[PDB]
Design a protein around this ligand. Structure first.
Ligand SMILES: Cc1cccc(NC(=O)CN(C)CC#N)n1
Length: 151
């Protein structure tokens, strides 16, 4: 499982870096100890092997799988186009869109790690436990994913 988490990290990193250069909006939520099955069930089931290639193809704009969140559970991309709870926090900047609000929302009610790619800026953001790491560098993203996902 140790190699699966590292492959998960590398897949997120490659897909997000690919989509960030192209300003392709993306929203990837990795479940952890708390189940996210209710929101998996809101999307289109994939139950697919994790890969950067599939993550990218899912988020291509105007495609059947892009409008929503990808939820990763265990060693599978469980679903795409899932809905996530939107945070009601007035602290979150109005310059950020609903992807960040969804990413903040799910982080308030689960211990899940959620990664966002802004289609406006290409900035990669991350949410965990109700907090937002906005516009992280590749180094910062790699350290956070290593810390939070390799357990
Ligand atoms: C991934 C994503 C993108 C845009 C909006 C949302 N979330 C909602 O629309 C909130 N619903 C009403 C609750 C649920 N589930 N999620």
């Amino acid at each position: 499982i140790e190699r699966e988490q590292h492959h998960l990290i590398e897949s997120i990193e490659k897909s997000t870096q690919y989509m960030a250069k192209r300003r392709i909006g993306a929203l990837i939520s990795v479940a952890r100890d708390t189940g996210m099955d209710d929101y998996i069930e809101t999307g289109i089931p994939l139950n697919a092997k994790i890969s950067s290639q599939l993550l990218i193809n899912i988020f291509i704009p105007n495609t059947p799988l892009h409008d929503g969140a990808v939820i990763i559970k265990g060693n599978e991309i469980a679903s795409a186009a899932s809905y996530l709870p939107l945070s009601d926090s007035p602290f979150l900047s109005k310059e950020l869109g609903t992807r960040h609000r969804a990413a903040l929302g799910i982080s308030e009610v689960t211990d899940s790690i959620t990664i966002v790619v802004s289609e406006e800026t290409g900035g990669i953001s991350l949410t965990k436990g109700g907090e937002l790491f906005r516009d992280v560098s590749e180094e910062e993203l790699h350290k956070i994913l290593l810390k939070e996902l390799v357990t």
